[PDB]
Design a protein around this nucleic acid. Structure first.
Ligand SMILES: [Zn+2]
Ligand SMILES: [Zn+2]
Ligand SMILES: [Zn+2]
Ligand SMILES: [Zn+2]
Lengths: 795, 795
DNA sequence: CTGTTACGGCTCCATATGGAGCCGTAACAG
DNA sequence: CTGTTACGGCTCCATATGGAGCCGTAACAG
């Protein structure tokens, strides 16, 4: 009844031995990068998934690929595990909230059994051709590529760049598209250089919609080849639609070309017109699915029926009521049962998955969670804890990677990693009951819980300088035409209930408009009337969890900007001058200094007969990514490889005599990155490391006092000490002369902010108007505000 | 703690309600096709797999596809489930028994830790390039296509059909291959019609191995297109190898072209020569892995080492000993740890998977088994039962679909379906303890267990007619050069221990030689000297579980041969003669009578935008697969659709007045097919239905007394009544004048056979010689024979 | 010296025809 | 009448080039 793990050597784990009780609420806490996330995800979930897959069918195993076996000696008492995290799934327009939560089938059964006609369960489904809309094929949206978007200027000629779509540009004469267009124009007696405005409608229709089955002969010309062939032109729009039907970035780029409109026939009901005639209680399936969760639950609880109907559909009603109660208890009460699954956030998706899992009721399954208390306001923390306890009580086990102090008191076993991070961390410090870790002086978390060290409340708060940004006519999504006023040069925090519209109001309006008006970004903004005060800003920077580099040719050393100084000081040594070298030779991205065999990568491709290609360290240069000639030059007893393999603390200690490098190294050390190596590849960097690198790069560059920063949930997967460092770095950034706007639900970040904007008072269509604004004390004095009440309670 | 299933409507289930206890040994028994297999596999395992998949990652779910949701109201208390059956997995040559059983990693760890050099775990692995053989790339077998096989006769010219490979024939002048060959010949100054024997060696080398990077210009000619292009010829062998590297039938066909030989460098060790130098106890890794399981266990138990080594590798030794004990206890003790996983039978693969699962030790997982007692001799039934009990005891649940009487006594809960099969069956009859079902007179299984009805022992046994088949120099696989003598015209049964070589000796020798010498089959036989008595046989027929038709255009009605008579009698009616029709019009595979809209299929393709195409019954002809014009003709108040939708019993009752149809219908009814419909598609037919159809077709055709039948495990998934009917049908076939040879481990089939041949006395290389032969009483009198001892005990 | 801007070079990711088995039909022999 | 054999017709399965983001370098201004 114990999960005993002996000999774990993944990432930075120093051969730890841990025993975790089963069928109990167990949480794991540690610093950012200390190794808790690796020890959980890469070891336990990976081992469980691989063990379950190896026993499945051969074709299923091949489809799922070969999962990497973790470097662990032996693990016993392991059950199949499923991991729930914040990973949005755009998927397909077919999937909605109703089908994901597994309630649409029950609604179909109820409508078929009881719903009187104005009658089969298969008829009501939009996933089958039996009862789908003939026009939209069940999608409910007539999505087509906008003819005006592909050719924004019809007056401009085709050769001038009329087409603005990838894979269809006619600028290059060597492309097959240009030859096809020329052949079509020759067949239709037209010239390519003729402006589209002067082009006949028939020619434009043929170009944009194919030849309607007509076949023509087009000759092809190559470098040394020639000939003739006969085929049919499919059309630009037809080819684009086929490619879209046949990845995420490419799908998003293609969807940007097209526009989504409601289907004119069924008005986006995804069902046949005859099927909508069936009604129960005066409402059909579409009206029921278009209401919120709370209203739907109230309607179902207040439904009137005879004894025979209740006896016929007792179990259906019980199951629907239980599922709706679980959905309203997990923390969601504003969602609509018809909203597409694509338009959701990470927290909402994770909560929906948790609700589906608890409603389904699986037994003997290990559950892995990744910070479930993020993206949600503090008013639903009790509901989330109750739902998690209910999930645990049925006979499962929970491994919640949570950092909130409230979650610790509700846990039965706490495993704390540390003491530091990276090389310093990776060992188990203390474990046991919450009281034991509270009384344990060897852990930072226990000291924080006991109140030994906490975040103090600032005494002096800055005031706006008089330059205030104004928003007029904000109506994006579920905004009820409200006007807000954000000050400048002051740390600004925006709070509100989950799904109140603050995230949309920020991301889809403010950042997009600022980018379009300042950085010249071709992004369509949201619905707004006008923005006042745009002249007071010069640069806009957005910080997210996306990796800083998609290629292994980048590293934090070159991203921060210290690599140029390192190369200059290496080339300025006596040996380099004697050899007549250059500052560009000490790099692993140009020819001359990097290893020629491995092309400055350190890994060579070793292809196997029946195995995917496996990369091994290069043996020509021992994986140092530098030839032996360059390593002959040494500065202060160290070579370039030693510097690149040297940690940040050692770099700070060694480079104290060079102020122009020490300035950036101090920023890198203070931002929180005290364990990474300068030579670490950017691909393996996690979200926290990327955010820290971006913050350090932003802080390093001098500030002119006219910059604004837009963030989103900056405390995602950060320990309390990490929050205490981040608030200090944000205060330093504000004091530098810039303005920072963040969206954080953490009370610690809010209690220290110099300006609070509240959106509510309820989620969904119920809210959308400003409740209170101003100083934190003023918001606390407000009675009708959850955020104000919590601010008053904490202070 | 209960698995409650309410409202199951899959296949032929009549809305059954079943409750199954958890964490207990539960078996399900029913007649062939009664619905037990459907109720288990299509409902419980499918629901568990879909439930687990829906909670996994989106990409994993897409890779695994969308599993069909079973037609069940609601199921509660379901754990993730894994299904183990007899499905061969050829996979790749990389996978062997050692890596499947998960013992090669432990062997590598032991060798790295203790094995003294003549030292890293990654070095000993053949799945990584670090310590793989440079020549064979870790395969251990240099498999190449035989140059002589593609051109068996070099004297014959290329135009005469020199190439015998699909996709490379030059008979068609319009093929691109012929044009490429002609261009190469023109470049090399040679003629295609020239014989290969007269072809220069350089030309043949270029043709069979490409141009070694040379580029030439080849001109293409089309129906109305022409031109020139430049490319490089890759070569016939290179293209074949690339296609083989890039399915099962195609892979087998390609492997037939090639031959497997040991690697000359490492002698098929799959490891580098330096790696083989490390030895422990005087043996290296290859010698240890080349020994049998029992010898390896004895060697490991008798290994001598100091206290320090034992302390260092205590857990490794314990795990290896436990895994070897489990492997020797499940029922396998003759396998070699280096044999490829491809060369295994279904029962051996299932037992290996069960051993791996019990060794791994998963908790809270539903286990589904498909007749685990088949393919195994009765002497290991106790070992299999003990292994299953050990698997159940650790905290899992078992759902074993077993028919053996011995397995019933070891079960704790029995769910019996019936009472008949097909439409008659599909309902739960009785359930409970063994005593309750034994005392229940409403179940056939209880009556059989109580001894109310049993299989009697025949009193008179036939004798050979003097024409005896002789086998000389049998040396295939693990045969120790023994000679056997099989009589003719007498029911012959071959028994032996599991993996004694009887299956190989039959399939790879007797059937292949008979097919080659009689039916002109181009199949390479096994290693044999000569076969005597081949002149006494005329036809050879093999019966297996393979489906009889891969297309929905076939059905048992047309496979048996009664459809021609049905069409003739339909066309002979007065209305057909008046209309001037023909006997070919009443068919669903020719033009004129079948529905033109659906092309006589009854289903139309409805393509969706973002969903795989879903087939829906045709509405033009209501899915009757016949136009309204043909249905106007009625015979005896019934139309052709009614006849095709009429069951076998009703057809027998109705068609009693036509002897030429009644003769085949009586055979179909007596073979055991009393529930299927004549119009049922052949694709949905299972193994038992296909075997019954084949047996009925064979029995229907008149016998000249010069035919031999070869079978294999005919009692796979057959109830006791099914066995009692099959033995009667086999005795009828023998009395008809033919000879039947079967390989059955069931004691009931053996005790009634008129001739018994025993192979043993042990599995693997230990056995291979005939132990006893002759009458069953003579075999029983033999003391040193497990089969003889069991025959004496039962009699 | 220090910051900004423009350009060159680089890598990673994205987008129809032949063979085998079966059914129906005609001819031939008993 | 009944079995065998040959052939025609049918269906299912199988086999390289352009764009986006980043690093390095030169020129210009303060
Ligand atoms: Zn529609
Ligand atoms: Zn190298
Ligand atoms: Zn080799
Ligand atoms: Zn039809």
């Amino acid at each position: 009844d114990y999960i005993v793990v002996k000999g774990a050597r993944e990432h930075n784990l120093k051969n730890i031995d841990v025993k975790i009780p089963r069928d109990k609420f167990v949480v794991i806490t540690g610093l950012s990068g200390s190794g808790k996330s690796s020890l959980a995800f890469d070891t336990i979930y990976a081992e469980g998934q691989r063990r379950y897959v190896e026993s499945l069918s051969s074709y299923a195993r091949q489809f799922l690929g070969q999962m990497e076996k973790p470097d662990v000696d032996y693990i016993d008492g392991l059950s199949p595990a499923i991991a729930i995290d914040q990973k949005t799934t755009s998927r397909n327009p077919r999937s909605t909230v109703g089908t994901v939560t597994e309630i649409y089938d029950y609604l179909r059964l109820l409508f078929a059994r009881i719903g009187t006609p104005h009658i089969t369960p298969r008829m009501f489904s939009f996933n089958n051709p039996y009862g789908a809309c003939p026009e939209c094929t069940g999608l409910g949206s007539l999505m087509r590529i906008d003819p005006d978007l592909v050719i924004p200027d019809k007056k401009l000629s085709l050769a001038q760049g009329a087409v603005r779509a990838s894979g269809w540009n006619i600028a290059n004469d060597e492309s097959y598209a240009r030859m096809y267009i020329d052949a079509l124009a020759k067949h239709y007696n037209f010239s390519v250089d003729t402006p589209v405005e002067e082009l006949p409608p028939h020619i434009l229709d043929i170009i944009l919609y194919g030849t309607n089955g007509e076949k023509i002969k087009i000759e092809y010309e190559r470098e040394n080849e020639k000939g003739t062939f006969m085929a049919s032109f499919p059309g630009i729009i037809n080819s684009m639609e086929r490619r879209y039907k046949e990845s995420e970035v490419m799908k998003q780029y293609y969807e940007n070309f097209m526009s989504n409109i409601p289907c004119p026939v069924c008005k986006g009901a995804r069902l046949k017109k005859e099927s909508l005639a069936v009604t129960i209680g005066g409402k059909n399936i579409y009206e029921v699915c278009c209401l919120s969760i709370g209203e739907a639950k109230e309607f179902f609880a207040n439904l009137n029926l005879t004894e025979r109907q209740q006896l016929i559909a007792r179990q259906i009603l019980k199951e629907i009521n239980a599922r709706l109660g679980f959905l309203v208890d997990v923390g969601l009460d504003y969602l609509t049962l018809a909203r597409a699954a694509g338009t959701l956030s990470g927290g909402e998706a994770q909560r929906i998955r948790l609700a589906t899992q608890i409603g389904s009721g699986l037994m003997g399954v290990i559950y892995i969670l990744d910070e479930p208390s993020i993206g949600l306001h503090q008013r639903d923390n009790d509901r989330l804890l109750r739902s998690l306890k209910k999930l645990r009580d049925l006979g499962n086990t929970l491994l919640v990677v949570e950092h909130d102090e409230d979650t610790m008191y509700a846990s039965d076993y706490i495993i704390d990693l540390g003491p530091g991070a990276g090389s310093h961390g990776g060992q188990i410090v203390a474990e046991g009951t919450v009281e034991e870790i509270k009384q344990n002086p060897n852990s930072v978390t226990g000291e924080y819980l006991s109140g030994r060290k906490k975040i103090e409340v600032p005494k002096e708060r800055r005031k706006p300088n008089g330059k205030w940004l104004e928003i007029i006519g904000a109506r994006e999504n579920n905004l009820k035409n409200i006007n807000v006023r954000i000050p400048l040069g002051v740390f600004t925090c925006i709070t509100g209930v989950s799904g109140s519209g603050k995230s949309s109001l920020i991301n889809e309006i403010l950042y997009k408009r600022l980018a379009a008006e300042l950085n010249r970004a071709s992004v369509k903004p949201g619905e707004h009337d006008l923005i006042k005060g745009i002249e007071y800003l010069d640069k806009v920077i957005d910080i997210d969890q996306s990796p800083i580099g998609r290629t292994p040719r980048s590293n934090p050393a070159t991203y921060t900007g210290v690599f140029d100084f390192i190369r200059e000081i290496f080339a300025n040594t006596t040996e380099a001058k004697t050899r007549g070298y250059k500052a560009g030779r000490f790099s692993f991205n140009v020819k001359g200094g990097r290893c020629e065999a491995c092309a400055g990568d350190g890994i060579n491709k070793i292809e196997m007969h029946f195995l995917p290609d496996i990369y091994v360290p290069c043996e020509v240069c021992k994986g140092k990514r530098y030839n032996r000639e360059t390593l002959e030059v040494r500065y202060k007893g160290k070579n370039i490889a030693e510097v690149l393999d040297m940690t940040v603390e050692e770099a700070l200690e060694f480079f104290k005599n060079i102020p122009r490098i020490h300035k950036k190294i101090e920023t890198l050390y203070d931002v929180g990155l005290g364990y990474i190596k300068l030579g670490q590849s950017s691909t393996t960097l996690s979200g926290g490391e990327a955010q820290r690198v971006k913050l350090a790069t932003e802080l390093s560059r001098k500030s002119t006092g006219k910059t604004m920063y837009i963030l989103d949930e900056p405390t995602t997967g950060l320990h309390m000490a990490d929050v205490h460092r981040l608030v200090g770095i944000l205060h330093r950034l504000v004091e530098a002369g810039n303005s920072v706007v963040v969206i954080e639900h953490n009370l610690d970040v809010i209690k220290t902010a110099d300006y609070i904007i509240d959106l509510g008072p309820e989620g969904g269509s119920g809210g959308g108007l400003v409740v209170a604004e101003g100083t934190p004390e003023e918001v606390a004095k407000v009675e009708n505000s959850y955020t104000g009440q919590f601010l008053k309670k904490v202070l």
